[PDB]
């Protein structure tokens, strides 16, 4: 059934599983027309497909051409997501295929179930977790490959950089969800915290800066302070 705070360690066991987040698949800017009506302009999007144990990210870039001449785009976006996840699973060797796919939004369940009918032993699950994967496009290298794309493209990343050399996948996931929750709540402030010291750089082959274990503790504290501050404002508490 649903993935929640109760069954959280299941994310880091040895059963291959993927999170699918469709938030950033269909992205638009809303604008006025010459006649004073409102219209949308699509921009490139992406499917965020993440193995939370290994950090392997399958970033399928959704080029605006896939929307051309289609209707009901927010509906189609869920089916296109499910089509591309199904295609990814079929592309993986049998021993790399997931045993479970956890969708971050309940509206993805029926589309993904129908596209995965050929895989009756892959469980399609919702989650009660409120995961901040919408903020993936606040990671500069991810935003840059999506915006530059001129055609449909899959790009592979490790969203944990080399963290698993020093920390467990439980701790790596907690650091990722904290970073993304900060970027989601106050992007400008989070990015300031991550680049404030110019001596700490991002490796060419990495997404995040090369913090020492002590610097990660300082950063994580700065992100937690950012989130609580913002919260006291949202709710006047």
């Amino acid at each position: 059934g649903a993935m929640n705070s109760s069954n959280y360690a299941e994310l880091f066991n040895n059963d291959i599983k993927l999170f699918v987040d469709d938030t950033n698949v269909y992205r638009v800017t809303v604008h006025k027309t010459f006649e004073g009506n409102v219209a949308t302009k699509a921009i490139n999007g992406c499917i965020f497909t993440l193995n939370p144990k290994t950090g392997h990210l399958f970033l399928k870039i959704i080029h605006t051409s896939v929307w051309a001449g289609q209707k009901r785009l927010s509906q189609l976006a869920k089916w296109k997501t499910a089509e591309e996840v199904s295609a990814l699973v079929r592309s993986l060797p049998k021993e790399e295929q997931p045993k479970q796919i956890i969708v971050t939004r309940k509206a993805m369940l029926d589309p993904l179930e129908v596209h995965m009918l050929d895989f009756p032993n892959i469980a399609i699950r919702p989650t009660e977790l409120r995961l901040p994967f919408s903020a993936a496009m606040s990671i500069d290298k991810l935003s840059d490959v999506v915006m530059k794309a001129t055609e449909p493209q899959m790009v592979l990343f490790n969203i944990y950089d080399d963290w698993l050399d020093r920390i467990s996948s439980y701790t790596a996931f907690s650091r990722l969800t904290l970073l993304l929750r900060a970027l989601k709540t106050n992007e400008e402030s989070a990015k300031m915290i991550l680049l404030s010291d110019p001596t700490i750089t991002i490796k060419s082959y990495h997404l995040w800066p090369s913090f020492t274990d002590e610097q990660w503790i300082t950063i994580e504290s700065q992100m937690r302070d950012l989130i609580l501050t913002e919260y006291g404002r949202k709710y006047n508490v």
Binding site: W79, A82, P111, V114, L117, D118
Partner: protein
């Protein structure tokens, strides 16, 4: 006009014949039901006064043989049996009629209710859903599960309704996932009508049979099948006009006949709200929408 004699009535029981019902007392000199209209299937059904659980009954067509009811004190139910001796049977019926020991099928001349509920229902199709090939009549009760319910346990006691599953490879062509899920026209017209049922009459017959088993026996799997067969049509953008017009008539008479006090358990809120207000066919079922809005506005 045909007759189903009863050997006796040794236990107090409410006896149904189609949409009619009669209370019989323990050892009441009751010897059966006469003046049964020829041309339709019929159902004779039972609910014991001492155990109002297990409604049970028999679907039959008097054109197919001479049937009677006899209580079995070992298995504790009224059983239908066929009398193969025509002259013994005629002699039994004539005697019971002369002694006026039989209730008359109480049909009003103006009243097409039973025809309207069984228009497409044929005994030969019933005998394929309810498999007991040694008898020409079919036993159904409150507890019998469907082949679909069994997949999700005694196969010989099952209701073999056609399996309908909207999230199945049968329902969804590879490459047309969104199209086939949101518009079930290929599943309705190609898989079910052309493929399995052969024509709309057999589809409607099964839908009508499922409804009647739901209503007369409280058979939950039958109710599921009735709603699935409604939803498959209402969820198809492309349905022949004659089928939509016929479905509206079928459902109108079903909703008209349903006991007002059983709407809570016999009507699925999701399916009816979806079918009447959201589906491709939301504007195609005028008669059904009007009787549902006047009889059951709470469900909607």
């Amino acid at each position: 006009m045909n007759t189903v004699p009863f050997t006796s009535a040794p236990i107090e029981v409410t006896i149904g014949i189609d949409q009619y019902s009669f209370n019989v007392k323990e050892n009441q000199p009751f010897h059966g039901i006469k003046d049964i209209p020829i041309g339709h299937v019929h159902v004779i059904h039972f609910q014991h006064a001492d155990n109002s659980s297990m409604r049970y009954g028999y679907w039959f067509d008097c054109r197919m043989g001479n049937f009677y009811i006899q209580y079995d004190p070992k298995d504790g139910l009224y059983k239908m049996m066929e009398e193969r001796d025509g002259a013994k049977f005629e002699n039994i019926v004539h005697n019971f009629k002369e002694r006026q020991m039989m209730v008359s099928y109480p049909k009003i001349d103006e009243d097409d209710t039973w025809y309207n509920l069984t228009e497409f229902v044929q005994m030969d199709k019933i005998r394929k859903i309810v498999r007991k090939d040694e008898n020409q009549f079919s036993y159904v009760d409150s507890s019998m599960t469907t082949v679909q319910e069994n997949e999700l346990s005694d196969p010989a006691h099952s209701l073999n309704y056609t399996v309908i599953n909207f999230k199945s490879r049968e329902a969804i062509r590879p490459g047309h996932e969104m199209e086939d899920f949101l518009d079930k026209s290929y599943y309705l017209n190609t898989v079910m009508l052309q493929g399995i049922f052969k024509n709309s009459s057999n589809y409607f017959g099964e839908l009508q049979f499922a409804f009647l088993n739901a209503m007369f026996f409280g058979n939950y799997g039958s109710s599921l099948q009735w709603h699935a067969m409604i939803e498959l049509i209402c969820s198809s953008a492309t349905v022949p006009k004659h089928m939509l017009d016929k479905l509206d008539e079928i459902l109108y008479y079903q909703i008209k006949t349903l006991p007002e006090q059983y709407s809570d358990i016999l009507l699925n809120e999701r399916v009816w709200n979806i079918c009447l207000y959201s589906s491709f066919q939301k504007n195609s079922l005028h008669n059904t929408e009007k009787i549902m809005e006047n009889k059951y506005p709470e469900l909607l």
